[PDB]
Amino acid sequence: RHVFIRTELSFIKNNVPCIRDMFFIYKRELYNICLDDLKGEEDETHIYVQKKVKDSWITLNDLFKETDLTGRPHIFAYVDVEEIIILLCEDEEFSNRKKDMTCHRFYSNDGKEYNNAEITISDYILKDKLLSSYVSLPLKIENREYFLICGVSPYKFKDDDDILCMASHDKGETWGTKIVIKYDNYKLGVQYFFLRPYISKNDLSFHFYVGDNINNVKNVNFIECTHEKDLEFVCSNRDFLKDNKVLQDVSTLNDEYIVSYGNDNNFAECYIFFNNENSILIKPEKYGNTAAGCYGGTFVKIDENRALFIYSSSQGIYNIHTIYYANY
């Protein structure tokens, strides 16, 4: 056996505050979809595509300024081997049972020059299904490429259907394709949050927090979805519970899970586990940081070997953990 772990720490300065961050890789370069939504006298909302050039984020187009959208829209962005297609879909405040969705579509063959046109998913599949923004990429199901907008049910008391996606095979213009998710461990009185689809080598999987009723904390869950008949998927909970550590993010390298853990729910120290064998402790007190931690630690896969581990230990400061792994 030949393990080959290799980490290097770097920093990125962002002169633009971001309420939320969305990281993606394209053309082997790192980008962020920043939400600059400040709430003051002159402060307005902006959604920026931003590419890291050296040790600092460079602001490219603000995509949001085109959307007649009146507020905070859902961001489902997808990356392909030669393009990026993004969408800002509408929210469902109280009873915004808009029987049809209305998002925009943004397209680029360079991540800079972006072109837009408003799309309308009339009688959309995910009616009354709650949504949570994310980055993804094309999943292959039966020699067909699909971008997936996946959502979740609000509450559960009646046994069942409780998680579902709509799909596009025309770069996210048509969403008539219904993908079923059969996760049979949806207990009675549980609510799922921030559902993001982890996609790799045409294998479907989901990473989502769980708002515990007894506790008041959100616990990470990762499920592995198996394909049954055409467009039918049955999922199962992959266990990652670690003795005195909290589950955080999950990726794959060499076809092996590269998982993320914190010491406690406050995240003073984080640990990365390559196939549950080799660990690496990342000390967030780099760049002279007293008030530092690893809350919101995330993975940006760049290759079946590379993947970055990024978190923001303070405002306008990004800690880049440049991971490389080669088990052979």
């Epitope: 072109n115 046109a117 020699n143 095979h169 025309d170 213009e173």
Partner: antibody, heavy 125, light 104 residues
Framework: VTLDESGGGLQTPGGALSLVCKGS?????????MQWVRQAPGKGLEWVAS???????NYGAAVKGRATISRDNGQSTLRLQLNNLRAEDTGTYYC???????????????????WGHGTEVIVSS | ALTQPSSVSANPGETVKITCSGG????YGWYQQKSPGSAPVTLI????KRPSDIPSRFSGSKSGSTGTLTITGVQAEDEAVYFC?????????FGAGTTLTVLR
């Protein structure tokens, strides 16, 4: 691939018109975005209608409202019903295929790789 | 909203260039028609991709919102209307078609 658009000719003004583009030699025709483009006599090229793999229908400003483009995936055919015909609706009609990898938007004309023979449609009494 | 020329003139052997400007798109496309009744033949689709049986002298290019066809080493048989096709917020837009004239 060969595109055989047929089913068009001397039609009466203020009437319906169904052309059929017969796709031949296709591998997963379903996947391609399909199109209709026309050329009035002594005039240039005009986009008429598009249909993405998921049914993404878009019609040219000139025909929107009376046109209907569709695809019978099973028989690899592309159809176009256009009602209330006019003199503006005269000219040759070309059946177009969008490149395999796609385009920015299904209704673009910067990604056509295949064209058919052309069915000349004449609206006149 | 595609603005390309009406006429372009080249002597055989010279390299010629047609410029198609405008549109909100990621890709341009060039189509050749020899006679008005003639069916279009794609020369370059998706900015540079060249379909089968199209000469190497046919080159695709794109700088900003302007596509450019380059005929490197013109031949007499290149006399034709050359339309460009792209995408607007309306739909698929075309160019006036540049008629290439071969000088003699």
């Amino acid at each position: 691939v060969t595109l055989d658009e047929s089913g068009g000719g001397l039609q009466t003004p203020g009437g319906a018109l169904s052309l059929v583009c017969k796709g031949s030699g296709f591998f997963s025709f379903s996947s391609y975005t399909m199109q209709w483009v026309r050329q009035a006599p002594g005039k240039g090229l005009e986009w008429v209608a598009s249909i993405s793999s998921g049914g993404g229908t878009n019609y040219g400003a000139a025909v929107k409202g009376r046109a209907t483009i569709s695809r019978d995936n099973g028989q690899s055919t592309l159809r176009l019903q256009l009602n209330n015909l006019r003199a503006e609706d005269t000219g040759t009609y070309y059946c177009a295929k969008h490149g395999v990898n796609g385009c920015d938007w299904s209704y673009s004309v910067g990604c056509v790789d295949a064209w058919g023979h052309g069915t000349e449609v004449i609206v006149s009494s | 909203a595609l603005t390309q020329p009406s006429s372009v003139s080249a002597n055989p052997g010279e390299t010629v260039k047609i410029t198609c400007s405008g549109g909100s798109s990621s890709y341009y496309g060039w189509y050749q028609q020899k006679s008005p009744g003639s069916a279009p033949v794609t020369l370059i689709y998706n900015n540079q991709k060249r379909p089968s049986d199209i000469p190497s002298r046919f080159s695709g290019s794109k700088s900003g919102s302007t596509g450019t066809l380059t005929i490197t080493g013109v031949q007499a048989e290149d006399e034709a209307v050359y339309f460009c096709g792209s995408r607007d917020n309306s739909g698929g837009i075309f160019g006036a078609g540049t008629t290439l004239t071969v000088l003699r």
